[PDB]
Amino acid sequence: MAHSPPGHHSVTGRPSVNGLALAEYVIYRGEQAYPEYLITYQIMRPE
Amino acid sequence: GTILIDLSPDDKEFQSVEEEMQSTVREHRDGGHAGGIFNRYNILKIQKVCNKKLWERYTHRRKEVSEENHNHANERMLFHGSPFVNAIIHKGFDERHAYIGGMFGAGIYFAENSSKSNQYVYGIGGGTGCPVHKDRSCYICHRQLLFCRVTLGKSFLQFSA
Numbered sequence A: 001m002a003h004s005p006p007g008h009h010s011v012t013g014r015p016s017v018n019g020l021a022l023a024e025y026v027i028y029r030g031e032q033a034y035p036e037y038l039i040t041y042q043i044m045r046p047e
Numbered sequence B: 001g002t003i004l005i006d007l008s009p010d011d012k013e014f015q016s017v018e019e020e021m022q023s024t025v026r027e028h029r030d031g032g033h034a035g036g037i038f039n040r041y042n043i044l045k046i047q048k049v050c051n052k053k054l055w056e057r058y059t060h061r062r063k064e065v066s067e068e069n070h071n072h073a074n075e076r077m078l079f080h081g082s083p084f085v086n087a088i089i090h091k092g093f094d095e096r097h098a099y100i101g102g103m104f105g106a107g108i109y110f111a112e113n114s115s116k117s118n119q120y121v122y123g124i125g126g127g128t129g130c131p132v133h134k135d136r137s138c139y140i141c142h143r144q145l146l147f148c149r150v151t152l153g154k155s156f157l158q159f160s161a
């Protein structure tokens, strides 16, 4: 695993082309996330 | 140490999680190549993941971050899709869940869009799709995402395509 940038605890990827995309995030320490919900699902074929 | 508690679909907690799942679907640039073609999901089950050790590990770190950032953990709820979802719920996130080739370097990646995390469930770029049908767009096979509490603290803002 790489390191967070100096002075920072994570990285945000801000979408700058696709108007509809939401942000993505990166942490560099496993302890900075807790897997709270397990969601089981199927994707649905559009009609 | 991990136990999974099923939530009833009548439980407001089931409903608010489902709604974050459905409402953060978007179309993807790949036309569905990685994750399949869909506008919404069929939610089959939502389970609360309870592990005392992993939780305390999380909150210990959260305090460290908070104290380095004017008492602000900058905590979010974000989606994660991975072939290693069963290892994650039992052993926690570690460097083996890192996206080595990720565009912001080798770390563990999370998405606000559920449909984005969906693209990783079967591997980077969706791998070869589901185990059974080798279909990245399989409408039959059961998939799993994690909805996660993530501490961002001071986040480095990268503007990007």
Ligand SMILES: N#CCOC(=O)c1ccc(-c2cc(=O)c3ccccc3o2)cc1
Binding pocket: A024, A025, B079, B080, B081, B082, B083, B096, B097, B098, B099, B100, B101, B109, B110, B111, B116, B117, B118, B120, B123, B124
């Ligand atoms: N290198 C390596 C091993 O890579 C993985 O198995 C892996 C890579 C990426 C993800 C992942 C999972 C995500 O949910 C995600 C969300 C937004 C952007 C990227 C994302 O990537 C999950 C697992």
Ligand SMILES: [Zn+2]
Binding pocket: B130, B131, B132, B133, B134, B135, B138, B139, B140, B141
């Ligand atoms: Zn399948």
